[PDB]
Amino acid sequence: KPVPTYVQDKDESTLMFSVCSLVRDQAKYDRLLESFERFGFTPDKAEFLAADNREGNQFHGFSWHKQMLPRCKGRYVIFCHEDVELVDRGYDDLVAAIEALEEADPKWLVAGVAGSPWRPLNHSVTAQALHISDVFGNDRRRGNVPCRVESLDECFLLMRRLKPVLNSYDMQGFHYYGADLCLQAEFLGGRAYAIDFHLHHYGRAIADENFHRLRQEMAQKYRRWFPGRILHCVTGRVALGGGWYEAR
């Protein structure tokens, strides 16, 4: 008697992007939406969804995607802050960057615009690879993008809707959810990249008690599986400790 739905291995999306944002400030988010539509993210190419933090912290960096993903219909799902704005590069640029990455390295799972190169040799300085306009300067670069990374800045990242990666359930807050996503991508057997897709990010990092707390939680959690590793993020290196590193 039940009538089942048979599901085939086919990408039946017709929208290229689901653009999801973590929204607290209506004015910043309206700026973002206007800029995306101006730079080619029109209704036949993209839909916009917002995790609604306008009245309080209903969601945080590690939980918002689990609610957004089921509602997305696009091929690629962007998870970005409310305070990015497209300024020059647009829809065709982003498609071309993603398709180029698929060709270069089909093991990618997460892509962003700023992050730290994968497994830096030199732990005496923080490794960075990005191209962006932000509070540190307009149209600036570190390193060379595109390139493989071990962490991404949370202002803008993306994954394929049919090949997602999830954030941890045992951390909560508004720091380190970009690195956590990259690390889970490695556990799942894929990779993270910073691509070259220049946009403007207005926000400033907040090195507050939550930042210090989550830095310690990241080290306590990840040292179990990456003992001795020094994890680079745009916000600074994190010596995870553990194992033989604890001698001294």
Place this chain on the structure above:
Amino acid sequence: KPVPTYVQDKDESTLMFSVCSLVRDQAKYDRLLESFERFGFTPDKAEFLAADNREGNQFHGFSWHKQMLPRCKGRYVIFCHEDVELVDRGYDDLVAAIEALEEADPKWLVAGVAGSPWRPLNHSVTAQALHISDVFGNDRRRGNVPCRVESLDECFLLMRRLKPVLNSYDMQGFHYYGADLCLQAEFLGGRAYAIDFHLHHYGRAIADENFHRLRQEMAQKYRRWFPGRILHCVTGRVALGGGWYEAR
């Protein structure tokens, strides 16, 4: 001017279960659907979806959920083989077991009916915890369920639609995707349980070369993060090796 959708933190599902099966044989799947409807999985409570392998191996154990989950609307998503059938315990018993688990340990992320207890002390025998009717006997038990486990038998497992866990991308095939899902649940900071929900699984243990291939791949992959661990599955122990265990 885009019109965004604002998303709130609420479970809007009206169906309790999305029952997803990996299907190659129509007669076995018809028998499954008949049994689920008989034992209380009516259209007001459950929908049924099939990863369609009737014509070829379009999906395999580690990929099928990524196509199924977007199509599910139920609170809990069951992933089962086509050759399980309900025979005594039904809809109300499963709901009661999941609600009890949620009360006992809110950290759970995946549940199944047969698996190996979490971190067994005694590696001289394979740890098992199950209650099932299968090729090894009708109405049989090992161990004591419900209990936390480090692996689950793939014949039937479930997760919350809104708190999923993903299988790896860098393995493919039809063995060890129950253990892989439990290990990724640990990486995500949650837990796996075998619950008491008796059903009939009529698969055979029919041996293939892919079983040994995936056993080796699982050891090569997980030894990186779990060096020295002996991972128990109802199909046998797997010494992952790695680290100090390599000393002869």
